[PDB]
């Protein structure tokens, strides 16, 4: 039930796959972010927890050119650093 | 519960990296939603609408579109294209 407002870079990512608002729940941000990775085909086909984002907005958001979705702490770190809690 | 997808559904799952011929229902649903997003078949504005024209998914559904809100229709489509173990 916590509402967040993504900062411009994160908001640009969500809007690129159809997000229409400025305010979201954390669960909604996670849904769109996973949608972004699949829509842009950034996951490894063989070991599908690996994401390659070096030439992508996601990599600017993460601070690294690749990561594994198993790094839950890093994912939450990136998201919370790029939003404003309401 | 284990299911074995029929050839066409198996072809779809394999196109997004599925490696087996036997799965749980949850795994099939995960890969199927992944397929729709990876192939960008959802409507950008009303994202419960999925477009299946000229796509493997349209053969599986027998229809050129469907709504994700139609849960019974989705399960009907899936169960018609697998064999429960």
């Amino acid at each position: 039930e916590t509402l967040v407002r993504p900062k411009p870079l994160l908001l640009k990512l969500l809007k690129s796959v159809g997000a229409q608002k400025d305010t979201y729940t954390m669960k909604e941000v996670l849904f769109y972010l996973g949608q972004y990775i699949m829509t842009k085909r950034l996951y490894d086909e063989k070991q599908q927890h690996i994401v390659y984002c070096s030439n992508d907005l996601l990599g600017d958001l993460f601070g690294a050119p690749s990561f594994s979705v198993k790094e839950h702490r890093k994912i939450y770190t990136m998201i919370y650093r790029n939003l404003v809690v309401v | 519960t284990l299911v074995r997808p029929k050839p066409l559904l198996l072809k779809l799952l394999k196109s997004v990296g599925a490696q087996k011929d036997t799965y749980t229902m949850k795994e099939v649903l995960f890969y199927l939603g992944q397929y729709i997003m990876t192939k960008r078949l959802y409507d950008e504005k009303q994202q419960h609408i999925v477009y299946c024209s000229n796509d493997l998914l349209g053969d599986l559904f027998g229809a050129p579109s469907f709504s994700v809100k139609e849960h019974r229709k989705i399960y009907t489509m899936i169960y018609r294209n697998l064999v429960v173990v």
């Binding site: 996951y43 927890h49 | 795994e27």
Partner: peptide
């Protein structure tokens, strides 16, 4: 394991 399931286990 699909990316979707991996992602569902950070939504």
């Amino acid at each position: 394991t699909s990316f979707a399931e991996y992602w569902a286990x950070x939504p």
